[PDB]
From Swiss-Prot:
Catalytic activity: (3R)-3-methyl-D-ornithyl-N(6)-L-lysine + NAD(+) = L-pyrrolysine + NH4(+) + NADH + 2 H(+)
EC annotation from Swiss-Prot or TrEMBL: 1.4.1.-
Source organism, top-level taxon: Archaea
Family designation: Belongs to the PylD family.
BP GO annotations: amino acid biosynthetic process
Amino-acid positions noted as binding NAD(+) in the UniProt annotation, renumbered to this chain: K151, V152, D171, C206, P224, I226, E245
Species lineage: Archaea, Methanobacteriati, Methanobacteriota, Stenosarchaea group, Methanomicrobia
Pathway: Amino-acid biosynthesis; L-pyrrolysine biosynthesis
Record-given protein name: Pyrrolysine synthase
Function: Catalyzes the ultimate step of the pyrrolysine biosynthesis pathway by converting the isopeptide (3R)-3-methyl-D-ornithyl-N(6)-L-lysine to the 22nd proteinogenic amino acid. Is able to use surrogate substrates such as (3R)-D-ornithyl-N(6)-L-lysine in vitro.
GO MF term set: oxidoreductase activity
Length: 259
């Protein structure tokens, strides 16, 4: 388990703007366009109730405020409830929320009360970041390297397999790698025998997970992982096109998936 810190979420609007610019450079589409390609949906000022939750480690500084900003950015009529938890849920529904957005330490969900669709942050984040990686316009290859095969990584890899990409996967935990290979049919990546990729998807709570020998010039690294999968030095050396943002892209994926 690795949760967001208040420091991760400083100037969320600038982080989102930069991420959107990067996604547009890499794919030719903005985040809205990516969500449109994934789900066929667009926002129509749907009312979104954001409920703070005191469960477990409790309320995270900047979390609800960031969700407030993210939802407004994508054109939703969002609000944050005064009360937390069940009282907050009640408040949200009474105040006309169509979509409920809330998170404890284990689950971050979006529930559309109008159509009954419900999203989980983990697969939604994996899918969108993998989708963005795969749409790299100057890729020249359908080989994709997936580093990290957990809650976010596995559904990302699954998506890429469904989208007919040649998926190579690595996880430091042998069992997780074996599970991904036997359930998805991905190619197990051997770090001792590396090849260069133009498309990399990483979902790990660790730094320096992308070895130099894997990088090619101008390669895309699409990663929700925190901290950054690659050092500044390696990122600069190979002019890596980085898509990395702490909350907004995954939240967009959730919201557009329930429309
Ligand atoms: N930016 C965003 O919007 C979001 C970010 N996150 C962040 O994404 C990260 C991943 O989340 P989950 O998939 O839920 O975590 P997880 O713990 O379910 O999966 C992480 C996997 O990475 C593997 N791993 C660790 N070090 C490695 C290395 N050096 N090489 C290869 N594999 C390695 C672990 O064995 C584990 O299987 C976390 O840092 C989390 O905080 C999570 C949700 C949304
Ligand atoms: N209950 C808290 C929110 C806890 C969210 C923890 N989940 C994560 O950190 C996920 C979300 C994206 C990256 N990891 C609150 O209401 O303030
Ligand atoms: Mg994100
Ligand atoms: Na990382």
């Amino acid at each position: 388990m690795a949760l967001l810190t208040p420091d991760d979420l400083i100037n969320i609007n600038m982080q989102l703007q930069k991420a959107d610019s990067a996604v547009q450079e890499v794919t030719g589409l903005d985040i809205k366009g990516i969500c449109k390609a994934l789900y066929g949906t667009f926002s129509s000022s749907e009312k979104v109730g954001i409920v703070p939750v005191t469960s477990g480690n409790g309320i995270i500084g900047n979390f609800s405020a960031s969700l407030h900003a993210i939802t407004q950015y994508f054109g939703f009529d969002s609000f944050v409830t005064d009360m937390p938890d069940v009282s907050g849920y009640y408040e949200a529904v009474q105040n006309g929320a169509e979509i409920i957005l809330m998170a404890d330490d284990r689950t971050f969900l979006a529930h559309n009360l109008k159509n009954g669709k419900m999203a989980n942050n983990q697969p939604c984040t994996g899918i969108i970041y993998a989708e963005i990686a795969s749409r790299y316009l100057k890729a020249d290859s359908k080989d994709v390297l997936v580093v990290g095969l957990g809650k976010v990584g596995f559904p990302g890899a699954e998506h890429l397999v469904q989208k007919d990409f040649r998926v190579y996967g690595y996880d430091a935990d042998e069992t997780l790698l074996e599970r991904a290979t036997s359930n998805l049919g991905i190619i197990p990546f051997d770090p001792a025998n590396p090849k260069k990729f133009s498309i990399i998807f990483e979902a790990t709570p660790c730094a320096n997970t992308i070895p130099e020998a894997v990088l090619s010039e101008n390669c895309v690294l699409s990663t929700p992982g925190i901290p950054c999968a690659i050092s500044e030095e390696l990122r600069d050396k190979y002019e890596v096109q980085l898509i990395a943002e702490p909350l907004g892209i995954g939240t967009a994926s959730m919201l557009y998936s329930v429309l």
